[PDB]
Enzyme design. Structure first.
Site, PDB file in Angstrom:
ATOM      1  N   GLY A 118     -16.604 -16.312  30.771  1.00 25.34           N
ATOM      2  CA  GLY A 118     -15.308 -16.182  31.396  1.00 25.34           C
ATOM      3  C   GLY A 118     -14.492 -17.442  31.601  1.00 25.34           C
ATOM      4  O   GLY A 118     -14.917 -18.557  31.304  1.00 25.34           O
ATOM      5  N   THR A 119     -13.286 -17.232  32.111  1.00 27.73           N
ATOM      6  CA  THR A 119     -12.344 -18.295  32.418  1.00 27.73           C
ATOM      7  C   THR A 119     -12.959 -19.251  33.436  1.00 27.73           C
ATOM      8  O   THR A 119     -13.796 -18.853  34.253  1.00 27.73           O
ATOM      9  CB  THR A 119     -11.055 -17.698  33.011  1.00 27.73           C
ATOM     10  OG1 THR A 119     -10.119 -17.469  31.957  1.00 27.73           O
ATOM     11  CG2 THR A 119     -10.464 -18.608  34.079  1.00 27.73           C
ATOM     12  N   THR A 120     -12.546 -20.512  33.400  1.00 27.17           N
ATOM     13  CA  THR A 120     -13.089 -21.470  34.343  1.00 27.17           C
ATOM     14  C   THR A 120     -12.299 -21.416  35.653  1.00 27.17           C
ATOM     15  O   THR A 120     -11.067 -21.285  35.652  1.00 27.17           O
ATOM     16  CB  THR A 120     -13.104 -22.908  33.723  1.00 27.17           C
ATOM     17  OG1 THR A 120     -13.312 -23.887  34.748  1.00 27.17           O
ATOM     18  CG2 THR A 120     -11.815 -23.190  32.996  1.00 27.17           C
TER      19      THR A 120
ATOM     20  N   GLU B 106      -8.084 -20.905  35.780  1.00 26.70           N
ATOM     21  CA  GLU B 106      -7.491 -20.941  34.447  1.00 26.70           C
ATOM     22  C   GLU B 106      -7.056 -19.531  34.060  1.00 26.70           C
ATOM     23  O   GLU B 106      -7.836 -18.588  34.171  1.00 26.70           O
ATOM     24  CB  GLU B 106      -8.548 -21.441  33.449  1.00 26.70           C
ATOM     25  CG  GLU B 106      -8.107 -21.567  31.992  1.00 26.70           C
ATOM     26  CD  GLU B 106      -9.277 -21.868  31.061  1.00 26.70           C
ATOM     27  OE1 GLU B 106      -9.050 -22.469  29.985  1.00 26.70           O
ATOM     28  OE2 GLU B 106     -10.421 -21.492  31.400  1.00 26.70           O
TER      29      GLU B 106
ATOM     30  N   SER C  79     -15.138 -15.705  38.033  1.00 27.71           N
ATOM     31  CA  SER C  79     -15.108 -15.745  36.580  1.00 27.71           C
ATOM     32  C   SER C  79     -16.068 -14.702  36.034  1.00 27.71           C
ATOM     33  O   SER C  79     -17.163 -14.506  36.578  1.00 27.71           O
ATOM     34  CB  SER C  79     -15.528 -17.130  36.077  1.00 27.71           C
ATOM     35  OG  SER C  79     -14.756 -18.154  36.682  1.00 27.71           O
TER      36      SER C  79
END
Lengths: 212, 233, 244, 244, 242, 241, 250, 198
Positions: free
Chosen positions: D30-32, D47, D75
């Site tokens: 996943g996104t940070t 993010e 995330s």
């Protein structure tokens, strides 16, 4: 309310009034107290308007379902027992209904069942139901024979409801007549007491008290 | 591999994937294309209705949820009926209890949470349908993209279904243009029909094959079919 | 989820057979033999005690013969623990019948109910069936002396003589060979012991490996009587019939 | 044998729960997102990949508030994250209703913790596919926490999860060493914007959108709020500058 | 094993798909809609000569303006019919009007996906999907004569003509040609009888085939053998005519 | 709590548990029913895997659901008890609510529904039973005969058989029963029935039980003798040729 | 959540065996030896206290438990299963008997209740059978002294003397040689200590052995006086000291 | 209340039940049969609340007939009366108790003796040579206490009833519209259609 139904040589006669009250207030003089459950079954209504009218409409639904399921017309006995059992499930809750299920079936012939919210279900030849029943019984009982002509039985019935409409403060409006034979019921008109009374008074010479 | 981890939604694959959800997502790709786009005054949906035989009817792709909201579907029709019916109840509840029109953004959150519940418990299956939701609320016009994974996203425009990539690229290209089409529904719709036709192949959009819906400023969500869409083909 | 470990105890085989029932019967077949023989003036129940020892207290032991009513009893073949579960519900059933009608429960009625319970574990619930077979010996005024048998499937049938448990085939052959409709209780008592004697996997047929019971209408009374023989009573009858 | 990774609550021979570990894979993919604990509050940042120009800018808000003083960012499977926040909100509401006082961050943490741990106890449920960073200000200061799919959680000075978790952790550790006296809410906000920009290299392929929220005793009155407008753009400039 | 509500890698539901297969093995059923009414015909298919063919009920009445034909595991259709009839009668009780054919169909389809071993969405108790398809034919004041095809998938389509069951793929191909927006009820009758005759393994007679129709005037009616036998004879003649 | 779907569709569109339920029926002792012009007869075969039973108490194969309707079956015995009890219960209830006993077709439809329900309900297996239900509707003299199977499907027959070797006995009946002229006599009706069973029973006077049903709740089961007699008069029919 | 294991975990194998129960029996075989000996005026049950660490205080754990003042139990197999079985047994003696008749249940009946509890764990959904065998000894006015064995299957039998666990075969053979229907309690106790010695590897003293008896009534252990009919419990656990004294006359 | 009488003579039980059905101010029917046959040799009469009366009688009839079919046997009158008492005893402590009193007249084919049971809505059961529910008992018990003999014939019994009915028509307040008499004996149940002047 006054309703009656009697069996005789020419089938069955069904007559009702059309008055609705709430206390001493005459709510209406145009209520249809007979329900045409189907081409061969009739239901009469006395007691609580909404109670009879709602539950009998429901009865019609149950009846129709029976025929779709069994590919056969519901019997008078069974139609009356459905209402009987329904109403009994509500015993003690306050439903108010004095009812008559009248019909014809090749298997039973002319038949009449009295059904009240008490759980009482009775088969008979004569029944008068409602706050005006006694008044109807008085006229009907003393002129009933199994041998009335369809035309005479029709009048006796009509006249019987007229009697109740007159003496019972809670009955009145108009008379609705029905004749039941093996080809179903036959409507025999709406007779407004406003003109029926005077007509009968003059022609028959009864109601001798009231001055006209 | 995959065969050992795709028997239900309560199992993670060794790489962190949820195949039952992914298989569900596939049903959408196999569905007929539908487009959604909006300006600042209106939001529009355009859908290609598919038919079985030439003796059958074209199955409806658009469903109204409330006077200010509605959606188009791609995938299992039944699941759309279930989800739209739930969206209708939520819109209804917002009005009855708060005398408030349900915001599109909230409808999106509610939908996401409903879908989610069917991806973490045994026995349930994910929904097999994608939804594009348009609506006009107190913050203007809106377009949402709903995936059975529970991911809901607000966009200027998008498209789902087979060959949807076509319309999507076109919308991603027309962006600066259609987003400014305010006060002129007919223009926004034509941009929508041009977007959808970018995903055609089999045939060309006809009168009993095209479905369009619009909602906006002073426009209650309304569907157009047949003769009603003629002036756009 | 759980589906992975579900044995599915209630399904048909491609041949239309109920696996678990079959396997349960397979279990019964290794259980101590139990025999029921019905005479004109009574019924006899005899079972072979599976696994015994010098130290086993026999006077206080019962692993095959249970009293259900004053007029009904059963012989068990299979899991004793499973049988006790059923036995106890049968005892309650008889008392319920009595409480409701003020009349002792007709033997078949008790047997049908117990059989219905077994049948259930066969059609729903995902539970294993009871690994038990019963021989019912009872008397009532509508059918007199009766002998029934029920197994894991929930099916039951009546018999003149029958066995359940191990070596039933050999035992059935021996019974179907010397049984006569006009037998007398004592005759049945002997036929019973002889059969066990010839089927026994053991060296000799001693009293310490048997349980015995009879349902006779002791003439000097007019009522029926159940008698679950005691260790000595079996030791006696054993010497008499000529098995010492 | 094998197959210890097909069912959730199962222990492998080495004492592990593979289904949980697989959940972590969804999280790392996943996104940070991060969390920085300043001297009187906490700062959250994440993010937001711009899959396409079609996503309305500033519209798909990731960070979520619980009650009025708690911030949550995660995330992995977004839907799983919302699900956990819904539980947190109910959890916080139930606590306040009875104890009157808004829920202390530490108590909130364990509430999320027990719930997430509960999803590793049965095969009828799946573990959460998210790692969550959350915290706020309470009676005794600021608190920052991170919760894993296993249900594990601890208090942090700085925390990161997702694709660029390594860059972030590297950067956060740097801040810790260069600020033993503490960081201010204003500074934490700028530094957060930078850490996100840096960590965006492990995904430099797609363009992104920054999102920051904060809860500071002196800057927000202990209430959770999103950093918008000028303070936001200012932080973006501070990052865009140090990225070159 | 595998959940009864599992998706295949192609995005379909196994049980539903397998369900459709059982339907293909069913007795043929055909429906033809005309501006004069809708005709519903079905293949009786007796498994023996001792079986009183008239006890085969594959065409039933939902309401006076709605009837339907079934194909597949016919025993599965009983609860579907009960539900359809109850819905039709109940709508009348609550709204004092007949139910629209489309709604009645939508109602039947709603039971469709109500299966599973614990699907999170309500309380779907039914261990498997239905194994029968239906052709619902009727009339209502809003859209006139209508013919619907309802499958265990929960979806339903409206057709001018449609055939389901064993010889369907062929029969449907036929219908694709024979049907036109001006057919008369009589024309639709012979057409149904003709297509049935083609796909039926048996020599179509008034005993292994049954016809019925629904008209605004007399509602849903199932033609008696005598009436159908004459329509059969009438067919053989026009066919041998060229 | 147990709700696993045991009856489900397989690739080719079959419900194996229902099919295997028929296999249980195929293995069951034979049962047959033939309707005359003023009666219906039901005959069942008695196994012989073990013989030393007390025929007085051992449950018979023909059950009375009400005084004018009977039911016989082939398949699992334990399973049949359940169906018979339910049917009996329903018969009493119908008499109570409709104030008229059930028609054979109605009672049949009820039993079949119970079987169908057990083919799509979680946690239960289908009944390994096929039944034959026969009698005379109330105040009607036209004989009624129906058959039901695990699937839940039913239908009426002029004559039918189920159970082991039912394939054989059906052939016998298909080429020995004329709808044009049905066994106009109770006696000739019982003969055709005993004949059809002998095709498979292989000399079994005590292995054949017949039950005769006449209009207006007239039901009775013949004894070994009455039956043995039919068997006798029939073995001569053969030899006298 | 919600236990979805509503199906049996113990089923019949094609051979007719119930695996889970056989396996449970196997676990019992691996357990420390325990035995029971019935005398003419008492019963004795004993076992070895297999301390699982010299740092553990073996007194804090009791393998011999009092169920009612006249009934005791000992076991072989999985100690934790036994522990919960003891709690259930003490409770059921109350809920299903004392609360009804105002008197403790006779030995055979309580054993019957315990046995039922075990049978249910053999058929109910989602559970495994208990991995233990019990030896229950007690006394009741109309039955005198009795000794019972209850296996994981739910089956139980009455014994004059017996042993279960690790060295049961050897122990049983030894008991058969020494038992007779004339043993006094002290004799049975002596015999018990002798039988246990063979099965004990290391130390053998009142601290590694656990033994209780069901003998005469102990009015001195009642805790109160005043009710003639209440004479005291028949169950009594011997003390470490009491054991060593007898070990010297071994 | 309605009249419910029962008298057991030498070889039979005779039940008499009023034919009137009055509701408030009107007698609605005068030929009502307050009875249900539970089995070929067991007859039950009843009186009480408007709906409970028949619902209870029919509910029991259904159960006894069900028992008959299942067991292909007829329960003794003693067994039937016990089943009935049990049902009423449950009723008395239920939410809405059945307000029904009944007389059970049966012929026990096994003992070959007639039996009469009186059971009220409380579940009070007693076996007697003669019984009655309601106010009738206040006139008929002492009457029969005088004119009753164990070995009487069925014909004698009917005269004994005629005696009871006359007393009731003379002293009771309401017009019960006569009674319907039925006889239960070894040959079953039959109605004495001629009592309106016997």
């Amino acid at each position: 309310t006054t309703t009656l139904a009697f069996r005789f040589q020419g089938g069955i006669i069904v007559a009702v009034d059309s008055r609705a009250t709430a206390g001493n207030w005459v709510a209406s003089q145009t209520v249809k107290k007979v329900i045409e459950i189907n081409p061969f079954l009739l239901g009469t209504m006395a007691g609580g308007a909404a109670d009879c009218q709602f539950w009998e409409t429901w009865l019609g639904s149950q009846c129709r379902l029976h025929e779709l399921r069994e590919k056969e017309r519901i019997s008078v006995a069974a139609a009356s027992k459905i209402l009987s059992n329904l109403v009994y499930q509500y015993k003690g809750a306050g439903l108010s209904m004095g009812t008559m299920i009248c019909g014809y079936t090749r298997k039973e012939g002319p038949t009449i069942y009295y059904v009240d919210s008490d759980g009482t279900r009775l088969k008979g030849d004569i029944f008068c139901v409602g706050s005006g029943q006694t008044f109807a019984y008085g006229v009907l009982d003393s002129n009933y024979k199994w041998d009335l002509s369809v035309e005479d039985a029709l009048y006796l019935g009509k006249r019987s409801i007229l009697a109740a409409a007159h003496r019972d403060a809670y009955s009145g409006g108009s008379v609705n007549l029905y004749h039941v034979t093996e080809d179903g019921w036959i409507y025999h008109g709406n007779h407004d007491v406003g003109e029926l009374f005077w007509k009968v008074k003059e022609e028959e010479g009864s109601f001798n008290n009231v001055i006209g | 591999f995959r065969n050992n981890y795709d028997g239900d939604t309560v199992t993670f694959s060794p790489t962190g994937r949820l195949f039952q959800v992914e298989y569900a997502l596939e049903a959408i790709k196999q569905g007929s294309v539908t487009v959604g786009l909006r300006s600042n005054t209106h939001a529009v949906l355009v859908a290609l209705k598919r038919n079985a035989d030439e003796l059958s009817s074209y199955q409806k792709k658009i469903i109204k949820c409330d006077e200010h909201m509605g959606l188009s579907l791609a995938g299992l029709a039944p699941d759309a009926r279930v989800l739209s019916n739930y969206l209708r109840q939520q819109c209804n509840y917002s009005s009855l209890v708060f005398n408030r029109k349900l915001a599109v953004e909230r409808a999106g959150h509610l939908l996401c949470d409903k879908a989610q519940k069917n991806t973490q418990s045994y026995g349930g299956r994910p929904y097999g349908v994608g939804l594009l939701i348009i609506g006009y609320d107190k913050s203007g016009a809106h377009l949402l993209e709903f995936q059975p994974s529970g991911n809901v996203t607000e966009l200027y425009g998008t498209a789902i279904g087979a060959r949807s990539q076509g319309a999507k690229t076109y919308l991603e290209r027309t962006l600066d243009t259609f987003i400014k089409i305010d006060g002129n529904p007919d223009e926004l719709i034509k941009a929508g029909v041009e977007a959808i036709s970018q995903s055609l192949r089999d045939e060309s959009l006809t009168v009993d094959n095209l479905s369009i819906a619009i909602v906006g400023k002073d426009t209650p969500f309304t569907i157009y079919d047949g003769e009603a869409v003629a002036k756009y083909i | 989820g759980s589906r992975r470990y579900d044995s599915r105890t209630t399904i048909f085989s491609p041949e239309g057979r109920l696996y678990q029932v079959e396997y349960a019967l397979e279990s019964i077949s290794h259980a101590g033999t139990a025999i029921g023989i019905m005479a004109s003036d009574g019924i006899v129940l005899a079972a072979e005690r599976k696994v015994t020892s010098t130290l086993l207290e026999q006077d206080t032991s019962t692993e095959k013969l249970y009293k259900l009513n004053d007029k009904i009893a059963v012989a068990v073949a299979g899991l004793t623990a499973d049988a006790e579960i059923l036995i106890n519900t049968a005892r309650i059933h008889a008392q319920n019948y009595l409480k409701t009608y003020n009349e002792d429960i007709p033997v078949e009625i008790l047997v049908r109910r117990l059989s219905d319970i077994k049948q259930g574990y066969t059609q729903h619930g995902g539970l294993r069936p009871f690994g038990v077979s019963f021989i019912y010996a009872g008397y009532d005024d509508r059918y007199g002396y009766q002998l029934y048998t029920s197994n894991p499937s929930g099916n039951y049938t009546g018999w003149k003589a029958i066995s359940v448990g191990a070596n039933t085939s050999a035992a059935q052959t021996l019974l179907q060979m010397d049984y006569k409709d006009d037998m007398k209780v004592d005759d049945a008592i002997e036929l019973a012991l002889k059969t066990l004697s010839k089927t026994t996997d053991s060296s000799a047929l001693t009293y310490d490996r048997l349980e015995f019971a009879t349902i006779r209408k002791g003439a000097n009374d007019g009522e029926v009587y159940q008698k679950i023989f005691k260790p000595q009573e079996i030791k006696d009858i054993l010497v008499k019939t000529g098995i010492t | 044998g094998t197959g210890y990774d097909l069912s959730n609550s199962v222990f492998s021979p080495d004492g592990r729960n593979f289904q949980v570990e697989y959940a972590v894979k969804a999280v790392e993919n996943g996104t940070t997102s991060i969390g920085i604990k300043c001297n009187d509050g906490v700062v959250f940042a994440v993010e937001k990949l711009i899959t396409s120009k079609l996503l309305v800018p500033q519209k798909n808000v990731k960070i979520q508030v619980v009650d009025r003083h708690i911030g949550c960012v995660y995330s992995g499977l977004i839907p799983d994250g919302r699900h956990l926040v819904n539980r947190g909100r109910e959890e916080a509401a139930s606590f306040k209703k009875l104890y009157k006082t808004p829920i202390p961050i530490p108590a909130f943490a364990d509430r999320l913790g027990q719930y997430v741990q509960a999803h590793t106890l049965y095969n009828s449920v799946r573990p959460f596919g998210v790692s969550t960073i959350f915290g706020g200000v309470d009676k005794n200061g600021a608190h920052l926490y991170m919760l894993e799919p296993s249900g594990s959680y601890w208090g942090y000075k700085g925390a990161a999860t997702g694709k660029g978790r390594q860059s972030a952790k590297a950067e956060l550790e740097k801040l810790v060493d260069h600020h033993p006296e503490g960081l201010s809410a204003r500074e934490a906000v700028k530094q957060a914007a930078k850490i996100i920009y840096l960590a965006h290299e492990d995904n430099k392929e797609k363009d992104f959108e920054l999102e920051i929220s904060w809860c500071s005793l002196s800057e927000t009155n202990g209430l959770h709020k999103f950093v918008k407008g000028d303070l936001l753009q200012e932080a973006i400039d501070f990052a865009q500058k140090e990225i070159n | 094993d595998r959940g009864v509500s599992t998706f295949s890698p192609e995005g379909r539901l196994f049980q539903v798909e397998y369900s459709l297969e059982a339907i293909k093995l069913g007795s043929t059923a055909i429906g033809i809609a005309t501006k004069e009414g809708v005709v519903l015909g079905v293949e009786k298919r007796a498994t023996s000569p001792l079986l009183e063919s008239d006890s085969i009920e594959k065409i039933v009445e939902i309401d006076r303006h709605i009837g339907c034909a079934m194909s597949g595991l016919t025993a599965d259709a009983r609860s579907m019919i009960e539900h359809a009839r109850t819905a039709a009668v109940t709508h009348n009780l609550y709204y004092d009007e007949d139910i629209n054919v489309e709604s009645l169909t939508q109602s039947v389809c709603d039971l469709a996906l109500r299966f599973g071993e614990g699907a999170s969405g309500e309380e779907r108790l039914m261990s498997r999907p239905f194994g029968v398809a239906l052709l619902i034919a009727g009339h209502d004041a809003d859209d006139g004569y209508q013919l619907f095809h309802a499958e265990p998938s929960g979806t339903f389509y409206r057709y001018n003509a449609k055939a389901i069951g064993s010889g369907s793929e062929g029969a449907q191909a036929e219908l694709l040609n024979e049907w036109h927006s001006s057919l008369t009820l009589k024309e639709a009758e012979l057409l149904v009888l003709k297509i049935l005759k083609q796909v039926m393994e048996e020599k179509l007679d008034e005993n292994n085939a049954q016809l019925s129709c629904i008209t605004k005037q007399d509602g849903f009616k199932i033609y008696d053998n005598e009436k159908t036998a004459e329509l059969i004879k009438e067919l053989k003649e026009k066919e041998a005519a060229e | 709590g147990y709700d696993r779907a045991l009856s489900i569709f397989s690739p080719d569109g079959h419900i194996f548990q229902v099919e295997y339920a028929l296999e249980a029926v195929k293995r069951g002792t034979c049962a047959v029913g033939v309707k005359g012009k003023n009666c219906v007869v039901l005959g069942c075969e008695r196994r012989s895997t073990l013989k030393l039973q007390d025929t007085r108490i051992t449950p018979s194969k023909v059950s009375k659901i009400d005084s004018h309707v009977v039911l016989s079956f082939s398949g699992l015995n334990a399973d049949s008890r359940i169906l018979i009890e339910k049917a009996r219960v329903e018969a009493q209830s119908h008499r109570l609510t409709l104030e008229d006993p059930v028609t054979v077709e109605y009672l049949t439809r009820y039993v079949a529904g119970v079987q169908q329900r057990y083919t799509q309900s979680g946690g239960v297996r289908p009944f390994g039973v096929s039944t034959l239900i026969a009698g005379f509707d109330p105040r009607d003299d036209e004989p009624k005969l129906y058959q039901t199977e695990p699937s839940g499907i039913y239908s009426s027959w002029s004559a039918q058989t189920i159970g082991r070797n039912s394939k054989t006995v059906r052939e016998f009946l298909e080429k020995n029963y004329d709808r044009k002229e049905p066994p106009a006599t109770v006696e000739e009706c019982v003969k055709l029935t005993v004949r059809s069973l002998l095709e498979v029973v292989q000399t079994g006077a005590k292995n054949i039980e017949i039950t005769v049903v006449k209009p207006d709740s007239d039901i009775v089961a013949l004894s070994s003798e009455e039956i043995n007699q039919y068997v006798t008069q029939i073995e001569q029919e053969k030899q006298e040729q | 959540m919600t236990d979805r294991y509503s199906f049996s975990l113990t089923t019949f194998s094609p051979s007719g065996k119930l695996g889970q129960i056989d396996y449970a029996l196997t676990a019992v075989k691996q357990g420390v030896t325990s035995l029971g000996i019935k005398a003419t005026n008492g019963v004795v049950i004993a076992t070895e206290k297999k301390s699982s660490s010299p740092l553990a205080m073996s007194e804090t754990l009791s393998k011999v438990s009092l169920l009612t003042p006249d009934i005791g139990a000992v076991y072989s197999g999985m100690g934790p299963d036994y522990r919960v079985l003891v709690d259930k047994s003490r409770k059921v003696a109350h809920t299903s008997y004392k609360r009804i008749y105002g008197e403790y249940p006779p030995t055979k009946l309580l054993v019957s209740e315990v046995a039922k509890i075990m049978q249910e764990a053999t058929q109910s959904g989602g559970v495994r059978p208990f991995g233990v065998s019990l030896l229950i000894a007690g006394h009741d006015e109309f039955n005198g002294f009795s000794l019972y064995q209850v296996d994981p299957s739910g089956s139980y039998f009455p014994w004059k003397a017996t042993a279960i666990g690790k060295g049961s075969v050897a122990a049983k053979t030894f008991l058969e040689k020494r038992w007779n229907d004339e043993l006094e309690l002290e004799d049975a106790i002596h015999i018990a200590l002798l039988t246990l010695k063979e099965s004990v590897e290391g130390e053998f003293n009142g601290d590694t052995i656990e033994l209780a008896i069901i003998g005469d009534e102990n009015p001195d252990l009642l805790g109160y006086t005043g009710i003639p009919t209440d004479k005291g419990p028949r169950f009594r656990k011997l003390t470490s000291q009491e054991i060593n004294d007898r070990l010297e006359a071994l | 209340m309605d009249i419910i009488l029962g008298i057991r003579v030498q070889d039979s039980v005779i039940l008499a039940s009023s034919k009137a059905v009055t509701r408030g101010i009107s007698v609605l029917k005068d030929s009502d049969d307050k009875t249900r046959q539970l089995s070929p040799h067991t007859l039950m009469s009843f009186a009480g609340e408007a709906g409970d009366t028949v619902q209870f009688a029919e509910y029991i009839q259904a159960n006894i007939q069900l028992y008959s079919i299942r067991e292909d046997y007829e329960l003794s009158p003693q067994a039937v009366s016990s089943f009935v008492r049990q049902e009423l005893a449950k009723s008395i402590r239920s939410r809405r108790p059945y307000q029904v009193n009944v007389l059970i007249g049966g012929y026990d084919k096994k003992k070959n003796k007639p039996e009469l049971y009186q059971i009220d809505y409380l579940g009070t059961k007693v076996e007697l040579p003669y019984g009655a529910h309601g106010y009738s008992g206040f006139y008929t018990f002492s009457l029969l206490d005088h004119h009753y003999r164990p070995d009487m014939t069925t014909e004698e019994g009917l005269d004994l009833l005629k005696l009871c009915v006359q007393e009731l028509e003379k002293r009771m307040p309401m017009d019960f519209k006569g009674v319907i008499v039925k006889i239960v004996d070894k040959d079953g149940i039959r109605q004495v259609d001629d009592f309106q002047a016997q």
